[PDB]
PDB file of C-alpha atoms and ligand atoms in Angstrom:
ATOM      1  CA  UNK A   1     -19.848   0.840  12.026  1.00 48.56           C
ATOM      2  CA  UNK A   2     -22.887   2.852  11.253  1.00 50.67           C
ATOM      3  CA  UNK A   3     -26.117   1.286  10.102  1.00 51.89           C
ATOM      4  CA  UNK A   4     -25.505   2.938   6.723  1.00 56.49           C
ATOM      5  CA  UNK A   5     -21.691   1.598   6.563  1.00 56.41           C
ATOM      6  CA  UNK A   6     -23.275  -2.102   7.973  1.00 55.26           C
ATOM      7  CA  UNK A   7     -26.086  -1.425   5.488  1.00 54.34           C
ATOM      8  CA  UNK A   8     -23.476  -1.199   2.774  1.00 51.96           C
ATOM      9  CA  UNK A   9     -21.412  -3.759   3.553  1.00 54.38           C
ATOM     10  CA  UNK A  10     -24.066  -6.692   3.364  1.00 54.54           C
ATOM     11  CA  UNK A  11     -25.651  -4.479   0.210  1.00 55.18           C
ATOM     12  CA  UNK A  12     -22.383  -5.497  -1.319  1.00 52.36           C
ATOM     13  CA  UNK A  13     -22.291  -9.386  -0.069  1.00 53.02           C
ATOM     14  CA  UNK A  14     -25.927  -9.779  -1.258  1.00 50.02           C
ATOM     15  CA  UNK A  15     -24.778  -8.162  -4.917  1.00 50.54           C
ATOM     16  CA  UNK A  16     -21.819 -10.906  -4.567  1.00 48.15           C
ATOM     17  CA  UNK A  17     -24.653 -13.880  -3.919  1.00 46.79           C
ATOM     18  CA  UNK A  18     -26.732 -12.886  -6.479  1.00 41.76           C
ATOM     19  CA  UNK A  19     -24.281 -11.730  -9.313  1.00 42.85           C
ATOM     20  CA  UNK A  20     -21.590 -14.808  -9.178  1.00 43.65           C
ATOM     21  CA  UNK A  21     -22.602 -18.456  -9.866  1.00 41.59           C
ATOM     22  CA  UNK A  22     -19.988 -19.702  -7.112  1.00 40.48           C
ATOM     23  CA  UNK A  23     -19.395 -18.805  -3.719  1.00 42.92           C
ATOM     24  CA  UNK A  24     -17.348 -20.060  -0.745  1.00 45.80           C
ATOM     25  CA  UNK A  25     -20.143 -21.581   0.866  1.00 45.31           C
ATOM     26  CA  UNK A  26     -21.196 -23.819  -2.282  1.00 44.33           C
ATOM     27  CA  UNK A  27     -17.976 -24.762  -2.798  1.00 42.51           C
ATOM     28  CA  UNK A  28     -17.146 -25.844   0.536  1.00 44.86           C
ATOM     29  CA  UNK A  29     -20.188 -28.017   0.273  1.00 46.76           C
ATOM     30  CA  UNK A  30     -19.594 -29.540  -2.836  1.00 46.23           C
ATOM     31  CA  UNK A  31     -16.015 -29.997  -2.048  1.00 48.76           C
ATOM     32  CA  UNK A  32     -16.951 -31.893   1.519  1.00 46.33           C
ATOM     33  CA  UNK A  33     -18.462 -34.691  -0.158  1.00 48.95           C
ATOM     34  CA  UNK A  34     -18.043 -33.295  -9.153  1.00 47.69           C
ATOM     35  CA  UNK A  35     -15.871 -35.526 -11.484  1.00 47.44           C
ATOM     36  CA  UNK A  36     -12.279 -35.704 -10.533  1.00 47.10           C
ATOM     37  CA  UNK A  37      -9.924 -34.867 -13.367  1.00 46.23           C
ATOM     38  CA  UNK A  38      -7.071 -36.217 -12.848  1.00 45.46           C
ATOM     39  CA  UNK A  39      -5.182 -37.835 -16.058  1.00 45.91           C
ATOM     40  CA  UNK A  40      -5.892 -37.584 -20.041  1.00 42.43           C
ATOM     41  CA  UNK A  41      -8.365 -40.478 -19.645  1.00 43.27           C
ATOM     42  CA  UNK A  42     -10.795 -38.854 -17.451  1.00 44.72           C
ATOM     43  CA  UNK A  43      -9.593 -35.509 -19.112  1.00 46.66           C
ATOM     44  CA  UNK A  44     -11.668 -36.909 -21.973  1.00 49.93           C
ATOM     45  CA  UNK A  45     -14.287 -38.662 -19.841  1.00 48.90           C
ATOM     46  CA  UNK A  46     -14.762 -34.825 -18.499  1.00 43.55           C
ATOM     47  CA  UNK A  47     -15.180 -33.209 -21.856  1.00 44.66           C
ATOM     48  CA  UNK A  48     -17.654 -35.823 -23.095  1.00 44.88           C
ATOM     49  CA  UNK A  49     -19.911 -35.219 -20.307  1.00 47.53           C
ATOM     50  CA  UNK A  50     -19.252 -31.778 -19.609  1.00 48.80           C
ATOM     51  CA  UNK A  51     -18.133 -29.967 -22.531  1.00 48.17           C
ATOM     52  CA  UNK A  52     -19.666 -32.348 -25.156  1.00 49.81           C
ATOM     53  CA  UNK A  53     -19.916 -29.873 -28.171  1.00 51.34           C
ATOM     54  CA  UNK A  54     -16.166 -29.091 -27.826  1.00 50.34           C
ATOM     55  CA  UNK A  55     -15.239 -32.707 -28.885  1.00 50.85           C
ATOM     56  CA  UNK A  56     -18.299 -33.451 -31.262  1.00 51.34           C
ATOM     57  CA  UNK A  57      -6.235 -30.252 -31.228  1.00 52.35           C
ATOM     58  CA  UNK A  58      -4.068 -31.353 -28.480  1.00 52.20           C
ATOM     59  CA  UNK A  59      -5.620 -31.672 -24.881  1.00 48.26           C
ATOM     60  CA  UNK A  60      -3.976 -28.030 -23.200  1.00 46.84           C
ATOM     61  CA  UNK A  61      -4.902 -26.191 -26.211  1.00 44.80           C
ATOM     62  CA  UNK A  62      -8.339 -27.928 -25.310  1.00 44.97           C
ATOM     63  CA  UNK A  63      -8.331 -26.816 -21.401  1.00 42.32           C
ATOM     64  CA  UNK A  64      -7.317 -23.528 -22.102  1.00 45.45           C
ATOM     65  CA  UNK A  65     -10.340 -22.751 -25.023  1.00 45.64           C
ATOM     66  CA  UNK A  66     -12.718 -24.404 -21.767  1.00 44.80           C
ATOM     67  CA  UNK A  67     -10.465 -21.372 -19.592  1.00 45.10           C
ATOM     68  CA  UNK A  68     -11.633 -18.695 -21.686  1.00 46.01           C
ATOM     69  CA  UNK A  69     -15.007 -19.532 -22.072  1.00 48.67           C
ATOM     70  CA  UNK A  70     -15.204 -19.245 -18.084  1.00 49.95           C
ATOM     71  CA  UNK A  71     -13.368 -16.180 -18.066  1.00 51.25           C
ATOM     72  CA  UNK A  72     -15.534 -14.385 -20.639  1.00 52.16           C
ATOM     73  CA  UNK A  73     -18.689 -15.865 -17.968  1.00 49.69           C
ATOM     74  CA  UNK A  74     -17.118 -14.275 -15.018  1.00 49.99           C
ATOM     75  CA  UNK A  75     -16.478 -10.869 -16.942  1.00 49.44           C
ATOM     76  CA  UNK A  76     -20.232 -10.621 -16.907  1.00 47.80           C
ATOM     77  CA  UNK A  77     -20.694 -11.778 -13.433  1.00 48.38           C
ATOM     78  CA  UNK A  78     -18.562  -8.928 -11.959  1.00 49.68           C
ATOM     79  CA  UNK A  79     -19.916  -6.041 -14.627  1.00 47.48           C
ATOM     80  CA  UNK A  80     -22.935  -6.855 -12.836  1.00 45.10           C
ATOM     81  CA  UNK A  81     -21.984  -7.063  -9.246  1.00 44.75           C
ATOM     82  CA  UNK A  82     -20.026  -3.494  -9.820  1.00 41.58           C
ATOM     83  CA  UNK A  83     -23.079  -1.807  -9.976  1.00 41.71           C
ATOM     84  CA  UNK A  84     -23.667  -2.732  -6.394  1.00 44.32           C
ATOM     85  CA  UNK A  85     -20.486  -0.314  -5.350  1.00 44.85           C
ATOM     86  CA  UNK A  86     -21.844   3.083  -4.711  1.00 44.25           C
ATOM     87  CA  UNK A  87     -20.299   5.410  -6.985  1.00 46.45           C
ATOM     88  CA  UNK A  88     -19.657   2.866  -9.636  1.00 46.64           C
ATOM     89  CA  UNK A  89     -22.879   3.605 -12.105  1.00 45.59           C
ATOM     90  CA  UNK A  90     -22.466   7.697 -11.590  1.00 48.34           C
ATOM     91  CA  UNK A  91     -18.570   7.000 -13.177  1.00 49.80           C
ATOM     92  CA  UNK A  92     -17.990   7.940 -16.633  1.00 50.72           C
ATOM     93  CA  UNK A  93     -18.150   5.059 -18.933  1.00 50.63           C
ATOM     94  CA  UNK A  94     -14.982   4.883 -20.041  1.00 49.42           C
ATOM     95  CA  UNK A  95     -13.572   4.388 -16.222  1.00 48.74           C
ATOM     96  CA  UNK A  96     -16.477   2.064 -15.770  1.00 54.06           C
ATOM     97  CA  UNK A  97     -14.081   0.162 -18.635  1.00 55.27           C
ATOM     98  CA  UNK A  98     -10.650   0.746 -17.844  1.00 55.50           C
ATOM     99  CA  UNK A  99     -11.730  -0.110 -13.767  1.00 53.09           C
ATOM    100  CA  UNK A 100     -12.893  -3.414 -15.264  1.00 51.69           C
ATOM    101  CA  UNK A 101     -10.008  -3.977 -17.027  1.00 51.52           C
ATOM    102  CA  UNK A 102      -7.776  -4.024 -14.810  1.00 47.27           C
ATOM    103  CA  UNK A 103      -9.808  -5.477 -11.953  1.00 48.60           C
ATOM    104  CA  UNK A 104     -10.805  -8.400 -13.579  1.00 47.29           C
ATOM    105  CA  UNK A 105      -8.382 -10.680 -13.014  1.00 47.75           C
ATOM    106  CA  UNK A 106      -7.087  -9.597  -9.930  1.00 47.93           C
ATOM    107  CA  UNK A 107     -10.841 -10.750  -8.606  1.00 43.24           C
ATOM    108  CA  UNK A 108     -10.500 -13.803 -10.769  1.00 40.08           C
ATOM    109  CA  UNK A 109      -7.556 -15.033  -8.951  1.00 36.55           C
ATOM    110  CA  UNK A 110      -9.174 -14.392  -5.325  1.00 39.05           C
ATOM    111  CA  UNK A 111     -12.407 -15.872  -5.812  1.00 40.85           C
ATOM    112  CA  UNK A 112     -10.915 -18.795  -7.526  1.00 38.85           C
ATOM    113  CA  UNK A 113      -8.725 -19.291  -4.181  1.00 37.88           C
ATOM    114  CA  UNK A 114     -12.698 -20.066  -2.741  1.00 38.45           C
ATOM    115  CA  UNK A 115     -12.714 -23.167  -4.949  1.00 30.36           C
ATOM    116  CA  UNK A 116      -9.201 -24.361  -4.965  1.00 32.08           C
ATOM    117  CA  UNK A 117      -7.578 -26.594  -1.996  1.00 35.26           C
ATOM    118  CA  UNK A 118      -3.799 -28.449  -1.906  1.00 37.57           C
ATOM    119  CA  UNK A 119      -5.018 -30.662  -3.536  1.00 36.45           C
ATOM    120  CA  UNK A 120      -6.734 -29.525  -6.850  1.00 35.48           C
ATOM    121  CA  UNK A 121      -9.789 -27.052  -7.707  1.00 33.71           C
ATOM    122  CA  UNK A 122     -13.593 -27.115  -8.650  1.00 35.48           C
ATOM    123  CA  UNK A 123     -14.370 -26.289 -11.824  1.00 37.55           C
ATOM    124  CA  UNK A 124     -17.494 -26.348 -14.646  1.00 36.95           C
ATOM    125  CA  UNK A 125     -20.228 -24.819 -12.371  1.00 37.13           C
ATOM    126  CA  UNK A 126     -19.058 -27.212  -9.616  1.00 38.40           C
ATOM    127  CA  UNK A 127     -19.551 -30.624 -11.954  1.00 36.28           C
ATOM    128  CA  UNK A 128     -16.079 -31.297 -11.672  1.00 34.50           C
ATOM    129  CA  UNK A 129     -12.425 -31.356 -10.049  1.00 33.34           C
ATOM    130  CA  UNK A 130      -9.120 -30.996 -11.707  1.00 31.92           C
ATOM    131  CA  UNK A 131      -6.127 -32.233  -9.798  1.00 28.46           C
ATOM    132  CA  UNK A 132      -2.979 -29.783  -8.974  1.00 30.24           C
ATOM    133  CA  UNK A 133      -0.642 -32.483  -9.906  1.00 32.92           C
ATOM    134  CA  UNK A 134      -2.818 -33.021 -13.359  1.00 31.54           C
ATOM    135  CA  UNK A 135      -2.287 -29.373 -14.557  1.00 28.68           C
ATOM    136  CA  UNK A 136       1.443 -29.680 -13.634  1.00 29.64           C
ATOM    137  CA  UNK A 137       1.943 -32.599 -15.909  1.00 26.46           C
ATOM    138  CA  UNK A 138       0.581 -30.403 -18.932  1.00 22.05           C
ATOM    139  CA  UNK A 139       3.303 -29.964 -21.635  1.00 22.73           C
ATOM    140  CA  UNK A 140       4.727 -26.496 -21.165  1.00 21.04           C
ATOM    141  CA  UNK A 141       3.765 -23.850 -21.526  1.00 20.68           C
ATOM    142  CA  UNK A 142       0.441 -24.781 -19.936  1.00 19.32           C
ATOM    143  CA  UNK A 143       1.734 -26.405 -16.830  1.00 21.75           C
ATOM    144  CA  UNK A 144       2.708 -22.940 -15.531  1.00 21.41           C
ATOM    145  CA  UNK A 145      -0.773 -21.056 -15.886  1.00 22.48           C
ATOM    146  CA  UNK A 146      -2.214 -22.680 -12.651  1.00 24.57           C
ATOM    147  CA  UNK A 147       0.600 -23.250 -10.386  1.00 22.11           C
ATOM    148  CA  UNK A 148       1.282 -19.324  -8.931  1.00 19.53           C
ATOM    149  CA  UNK A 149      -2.556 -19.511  -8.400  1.00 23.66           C
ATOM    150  CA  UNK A 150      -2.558 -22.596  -6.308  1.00 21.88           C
ATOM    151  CA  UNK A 151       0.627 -20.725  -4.306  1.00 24.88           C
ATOM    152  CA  UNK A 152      -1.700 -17.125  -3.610  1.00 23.38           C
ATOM    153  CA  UNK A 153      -4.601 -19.198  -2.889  1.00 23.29           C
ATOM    154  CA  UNK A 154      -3.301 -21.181  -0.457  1.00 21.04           C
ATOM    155  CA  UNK A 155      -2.311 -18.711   1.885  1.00 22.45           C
ATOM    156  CA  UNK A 156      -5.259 -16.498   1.036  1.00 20.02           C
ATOM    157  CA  UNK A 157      -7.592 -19.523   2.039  1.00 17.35           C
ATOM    158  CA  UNK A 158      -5.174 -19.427   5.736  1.00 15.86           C
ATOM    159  CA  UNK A 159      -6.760 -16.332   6.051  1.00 19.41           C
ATOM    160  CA  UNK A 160     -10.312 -17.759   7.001  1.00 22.69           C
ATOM    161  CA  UNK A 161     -12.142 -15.449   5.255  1.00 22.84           C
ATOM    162  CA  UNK A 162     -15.774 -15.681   4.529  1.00 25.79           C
ATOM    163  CA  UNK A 163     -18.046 -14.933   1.719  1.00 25.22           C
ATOM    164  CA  UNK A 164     -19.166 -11.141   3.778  1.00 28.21           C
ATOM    165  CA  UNK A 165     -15.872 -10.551   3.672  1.00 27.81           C
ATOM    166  CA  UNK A 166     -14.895 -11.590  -0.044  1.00 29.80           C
ATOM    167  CA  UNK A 167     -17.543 -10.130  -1.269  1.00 32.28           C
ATOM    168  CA  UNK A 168     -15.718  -6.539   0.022  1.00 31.05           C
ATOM    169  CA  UNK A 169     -12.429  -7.021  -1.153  1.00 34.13           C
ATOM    170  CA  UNK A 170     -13.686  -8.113  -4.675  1.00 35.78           C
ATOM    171  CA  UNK A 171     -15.484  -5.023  -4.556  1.00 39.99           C
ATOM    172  CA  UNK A 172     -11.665  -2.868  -3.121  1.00 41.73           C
ATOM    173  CA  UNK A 173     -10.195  -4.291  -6.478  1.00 43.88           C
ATOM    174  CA  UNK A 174     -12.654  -2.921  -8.573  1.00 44.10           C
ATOM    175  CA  UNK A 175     -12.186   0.164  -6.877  1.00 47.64           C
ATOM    176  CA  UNK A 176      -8.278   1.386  -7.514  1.00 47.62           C
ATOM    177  CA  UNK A 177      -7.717   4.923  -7.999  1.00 47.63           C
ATOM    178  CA  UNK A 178      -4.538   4.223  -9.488  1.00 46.19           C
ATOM    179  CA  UNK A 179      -5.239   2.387 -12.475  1.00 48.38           C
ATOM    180  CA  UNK A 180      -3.743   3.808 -15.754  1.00 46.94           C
ATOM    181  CA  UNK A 181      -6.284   6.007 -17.833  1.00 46.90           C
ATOM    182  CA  UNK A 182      -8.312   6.875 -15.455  1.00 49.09           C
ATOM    183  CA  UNK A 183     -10.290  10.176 -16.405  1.00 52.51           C
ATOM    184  CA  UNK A 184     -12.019  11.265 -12.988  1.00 50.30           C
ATOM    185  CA  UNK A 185      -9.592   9.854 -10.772  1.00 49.09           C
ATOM    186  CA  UNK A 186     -10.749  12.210  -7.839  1.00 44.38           C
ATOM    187  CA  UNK A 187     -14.304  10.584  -7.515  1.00 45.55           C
ATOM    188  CA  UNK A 188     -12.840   7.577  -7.846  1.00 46.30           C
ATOM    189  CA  UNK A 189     -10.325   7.400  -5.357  1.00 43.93           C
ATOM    190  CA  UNK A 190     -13.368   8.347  -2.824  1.00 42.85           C
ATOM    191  CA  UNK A 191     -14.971   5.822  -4.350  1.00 44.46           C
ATOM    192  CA  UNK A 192     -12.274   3.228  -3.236  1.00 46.16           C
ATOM    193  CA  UNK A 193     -11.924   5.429   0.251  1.00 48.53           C
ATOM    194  CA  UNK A 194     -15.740   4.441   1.142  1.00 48.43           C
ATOM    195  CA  UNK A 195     -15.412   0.717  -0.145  1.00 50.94           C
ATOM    196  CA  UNK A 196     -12.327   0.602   1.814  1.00 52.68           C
ATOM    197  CA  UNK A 197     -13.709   2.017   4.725  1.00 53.58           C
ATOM    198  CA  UNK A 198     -16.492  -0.399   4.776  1.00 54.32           C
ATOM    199  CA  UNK A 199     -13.976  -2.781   4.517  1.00 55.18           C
ATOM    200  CA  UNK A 200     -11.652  -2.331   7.290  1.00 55.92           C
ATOM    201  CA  UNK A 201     -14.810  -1.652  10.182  1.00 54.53           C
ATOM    202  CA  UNK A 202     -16.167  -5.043   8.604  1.00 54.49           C
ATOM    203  CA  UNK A 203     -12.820  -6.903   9.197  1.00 55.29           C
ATOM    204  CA  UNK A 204     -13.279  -5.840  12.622  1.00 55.01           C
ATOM    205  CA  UNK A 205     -16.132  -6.514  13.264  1.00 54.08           C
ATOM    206  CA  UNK A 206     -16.058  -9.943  11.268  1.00 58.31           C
ATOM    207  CA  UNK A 207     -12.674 -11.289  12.857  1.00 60.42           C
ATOM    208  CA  UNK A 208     -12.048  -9.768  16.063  1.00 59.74           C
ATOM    209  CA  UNK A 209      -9.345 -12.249  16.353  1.00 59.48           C
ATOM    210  CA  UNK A 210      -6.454 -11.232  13.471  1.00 59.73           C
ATOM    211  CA  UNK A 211      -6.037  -7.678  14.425  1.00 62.66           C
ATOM    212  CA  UNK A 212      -4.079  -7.176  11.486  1.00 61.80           C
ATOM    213  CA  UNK A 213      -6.449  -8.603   8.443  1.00 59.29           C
ATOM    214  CA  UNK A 214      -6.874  -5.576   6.828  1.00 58.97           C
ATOM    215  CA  UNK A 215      -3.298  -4.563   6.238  1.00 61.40           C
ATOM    216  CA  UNK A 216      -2.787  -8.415   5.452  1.00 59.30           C
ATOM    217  CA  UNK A 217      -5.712  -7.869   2.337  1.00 55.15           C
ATOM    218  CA  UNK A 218      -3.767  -4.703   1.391  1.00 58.18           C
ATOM    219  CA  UNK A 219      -0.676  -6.684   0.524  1.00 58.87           C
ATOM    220  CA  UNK A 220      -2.602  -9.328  -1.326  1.00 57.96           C
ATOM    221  CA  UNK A 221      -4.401  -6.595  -2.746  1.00 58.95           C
ATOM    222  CA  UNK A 222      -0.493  -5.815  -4.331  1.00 59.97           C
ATOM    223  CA  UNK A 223       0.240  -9.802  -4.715  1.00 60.44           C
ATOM    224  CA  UNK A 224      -2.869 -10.244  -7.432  1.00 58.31           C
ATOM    225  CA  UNK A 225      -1.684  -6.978  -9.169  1.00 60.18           C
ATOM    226  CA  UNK A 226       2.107  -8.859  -9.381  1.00 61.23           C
ATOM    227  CA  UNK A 227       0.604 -12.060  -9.848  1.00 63.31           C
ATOM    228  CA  UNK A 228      -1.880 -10.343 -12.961  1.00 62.77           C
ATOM    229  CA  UNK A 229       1.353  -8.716 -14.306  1.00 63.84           C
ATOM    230  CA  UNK A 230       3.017 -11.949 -14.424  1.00 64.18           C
ATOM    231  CA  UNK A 231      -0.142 -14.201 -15.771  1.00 64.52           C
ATOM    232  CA  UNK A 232      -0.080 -11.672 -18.642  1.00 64.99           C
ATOM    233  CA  UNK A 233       2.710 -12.168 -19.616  1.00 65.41           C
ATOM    234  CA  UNK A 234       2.173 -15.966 -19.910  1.00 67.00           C
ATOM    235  CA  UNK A 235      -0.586 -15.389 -21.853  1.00 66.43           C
ATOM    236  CA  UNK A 236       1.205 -13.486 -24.531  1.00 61.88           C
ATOM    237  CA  UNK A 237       4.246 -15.869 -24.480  1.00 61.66           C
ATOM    238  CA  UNK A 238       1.269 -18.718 -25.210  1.00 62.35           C
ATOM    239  CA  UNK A 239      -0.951 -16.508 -27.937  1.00 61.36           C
ATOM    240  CA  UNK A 240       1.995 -15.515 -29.718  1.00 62.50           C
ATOM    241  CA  UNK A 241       3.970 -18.962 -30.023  1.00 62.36           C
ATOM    242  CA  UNK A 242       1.332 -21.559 -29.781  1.00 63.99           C
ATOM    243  CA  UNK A 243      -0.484 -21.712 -33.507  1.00 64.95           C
ATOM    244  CA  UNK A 244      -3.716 -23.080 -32.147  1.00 66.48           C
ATOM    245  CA  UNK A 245      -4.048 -21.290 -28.885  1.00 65.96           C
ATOM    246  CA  UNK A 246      -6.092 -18.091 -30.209  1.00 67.50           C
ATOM    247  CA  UNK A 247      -7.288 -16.048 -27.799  1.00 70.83           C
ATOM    248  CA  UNK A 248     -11.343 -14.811 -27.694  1.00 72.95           C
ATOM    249  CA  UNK A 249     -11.580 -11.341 -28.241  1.00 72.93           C
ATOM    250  CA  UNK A 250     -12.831 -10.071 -25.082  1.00 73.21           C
ATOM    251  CA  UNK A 251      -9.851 -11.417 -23.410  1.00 78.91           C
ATOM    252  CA  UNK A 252      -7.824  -9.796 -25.955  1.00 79.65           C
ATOM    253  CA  UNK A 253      -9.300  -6.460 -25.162  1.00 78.90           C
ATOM    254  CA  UNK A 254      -8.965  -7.329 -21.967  1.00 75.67           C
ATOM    255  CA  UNK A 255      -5.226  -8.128 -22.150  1.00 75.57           C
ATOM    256  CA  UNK A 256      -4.442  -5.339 -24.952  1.00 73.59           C
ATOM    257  CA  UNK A 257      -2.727  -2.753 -23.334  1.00 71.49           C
ATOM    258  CA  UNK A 258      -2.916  -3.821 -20.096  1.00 71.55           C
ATOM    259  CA  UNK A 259       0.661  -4.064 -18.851  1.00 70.64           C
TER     260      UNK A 259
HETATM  261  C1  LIG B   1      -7.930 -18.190 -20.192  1.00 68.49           C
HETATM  262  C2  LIG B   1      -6.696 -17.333 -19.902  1.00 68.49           C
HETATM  263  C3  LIG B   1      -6.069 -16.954 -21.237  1.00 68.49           C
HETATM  264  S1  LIG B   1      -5.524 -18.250 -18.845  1.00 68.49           S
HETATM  265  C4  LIG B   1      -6.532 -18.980 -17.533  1.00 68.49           C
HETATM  266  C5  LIG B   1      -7.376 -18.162 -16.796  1.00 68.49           C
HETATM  267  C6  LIG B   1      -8.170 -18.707 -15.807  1.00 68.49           C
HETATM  268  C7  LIG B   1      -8.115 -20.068 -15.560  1.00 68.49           C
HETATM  269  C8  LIG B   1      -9.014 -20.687 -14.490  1.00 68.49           C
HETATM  270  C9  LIG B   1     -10.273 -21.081 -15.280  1.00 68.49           C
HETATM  271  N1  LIG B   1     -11.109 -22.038 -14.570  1.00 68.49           N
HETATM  272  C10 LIG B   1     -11.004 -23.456 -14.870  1.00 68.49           C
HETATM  273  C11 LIG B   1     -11.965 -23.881 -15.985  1.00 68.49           C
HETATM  274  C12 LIG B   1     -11.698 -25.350 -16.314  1.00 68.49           C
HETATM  275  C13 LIG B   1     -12.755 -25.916 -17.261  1.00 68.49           C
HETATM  276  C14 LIG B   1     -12.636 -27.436 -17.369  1.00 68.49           C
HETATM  277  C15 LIG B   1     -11.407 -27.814 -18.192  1.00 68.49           C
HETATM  278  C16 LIG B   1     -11.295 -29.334 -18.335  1.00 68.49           C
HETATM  279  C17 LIG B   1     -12.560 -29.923 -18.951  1.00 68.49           C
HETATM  280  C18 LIG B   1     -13.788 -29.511 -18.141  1.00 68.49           C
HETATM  281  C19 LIG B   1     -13.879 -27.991 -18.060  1.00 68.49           C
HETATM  282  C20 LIG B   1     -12.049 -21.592 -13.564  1.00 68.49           C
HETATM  283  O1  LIG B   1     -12.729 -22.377 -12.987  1.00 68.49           O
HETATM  284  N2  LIG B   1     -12.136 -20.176 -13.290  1.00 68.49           N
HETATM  285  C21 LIG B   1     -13.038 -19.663 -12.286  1.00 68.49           C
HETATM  286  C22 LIG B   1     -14.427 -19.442 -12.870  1.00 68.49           C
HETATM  287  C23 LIG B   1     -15.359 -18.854 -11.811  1.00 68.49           C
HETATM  288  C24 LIG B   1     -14.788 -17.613 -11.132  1.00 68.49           C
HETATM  289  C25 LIG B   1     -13.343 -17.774 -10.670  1.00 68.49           C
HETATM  290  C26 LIG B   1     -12.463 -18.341 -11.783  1.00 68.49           C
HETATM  291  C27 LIG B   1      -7.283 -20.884 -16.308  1.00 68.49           C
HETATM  292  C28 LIG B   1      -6.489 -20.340 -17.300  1.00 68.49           C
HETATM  293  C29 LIG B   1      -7.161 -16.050 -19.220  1.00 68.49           C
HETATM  294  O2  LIG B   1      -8.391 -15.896 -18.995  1.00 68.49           O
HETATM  295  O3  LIG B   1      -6.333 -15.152 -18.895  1.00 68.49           O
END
């Protein structure tokens, strides 16, 4: 690893510090010992402290609204750290998008795997914690949203990876090659080649140990993209056959075309 590669790697973790209001660290902390949401009574309790101008419709219609508000948050928080990946300004605007698009999510699902644990995960800037067993009790279709994310998350977490390391592979997904649309696909698939690069001499280095981490992230890599797929398709199941479950716009750009 040369000093520009080990240069580029922590230029990326600092981007992922400064850019995204949660990391693995915080959490970790917080999570050692927010309030704990666990049944409709301190559902509400939650929203009055937390959400207040939401309550000033039934309660999962009410979680998911509170979902896409934190979605729409960490859309902005990952435009911004993309402009840490070298490459990712000099694209074309358009790919800028469509990279976006599609990576989204995918980095949605493995950074929320940093807040998450068997037992339920941190949520509303770290102010509070929603039990697994409390989403599952959620009239369907809602009580199927969180569960596949629990499953990827923890086995992800088994992994032991760290925030240097996160940091990377949130900046891989951004960077697929592959994506449908794509305009200048050859800059961009050097583009993922360097971030990848960077990536496997950093697992290395980073866990000397698990000798084969970086084919392990490949194949979640191609989990998230199933598990994206698949969360899609929820979604449209709920937008088009639940009356009061609209969906913001952004998200529906997001989701519009997508798969
Ligand atoms: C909204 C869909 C349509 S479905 C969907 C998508 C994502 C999620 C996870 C949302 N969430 C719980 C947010 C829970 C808020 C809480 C609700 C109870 C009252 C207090 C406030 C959360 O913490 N997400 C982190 C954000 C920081 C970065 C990592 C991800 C749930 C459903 C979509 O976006 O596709």
């Amino acid at each position: 690893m040369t000093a520009d590669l080990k240069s580029l790697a922590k230029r990326i973790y600092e981007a992922y510090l400064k850019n995204f209001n949660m990391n693995k660290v915080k959490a970790r902390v917080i999570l050692s010992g927010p309030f704990v949401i666990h049944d409709m009574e301190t559902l509400c309790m939650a929203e009055k402290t937390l959400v207040a101008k939401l309550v000033a419709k039934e309660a999962e219609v009410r979680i998911f609204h509170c979902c896409q508000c934190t979605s729409v948050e960490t859309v902005t928080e990952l435009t911004e750290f993309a402009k840490a990946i070298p490459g990712f300004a000099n694209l074309d605007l358009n790919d800028q998008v469509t990279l976006l698009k599609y990576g989204v999510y995918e980095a949605i699902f493995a950074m929320l795997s940093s807040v998450m644990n068997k037992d339920g995960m941190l949520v509303a800037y770290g102010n509070g914690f929603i039990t697994r067993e409390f989403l599952k009790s959620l009239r369907k279709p809602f009580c199927d949203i969180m569960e596949p994310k629990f499953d990827f998350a923890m086995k992800f977490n088994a992994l032991e990876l760290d925030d240097s390391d996160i940091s990377l592979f949130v900046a891989a997904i951004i960077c697929c090659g592959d994506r449908p649309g794509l305009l200048n696909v050859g800059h961009i698939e050097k583009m993922q080649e360097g971030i990848v690069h960077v990536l496997r001499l950093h697992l290395q280095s980073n866990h000397p140990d698990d000798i084969f981490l970086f084919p392990k992230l490949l194949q979640k890599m191609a989990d998230l993209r199933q598990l994206v797929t698949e969360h899609a398709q929820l979604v449209q199941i709920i937008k088009k056959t639940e009356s009061d479950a609209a969906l913001h716009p952004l998200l529906q750009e997001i989701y519009r075309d997508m798969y």
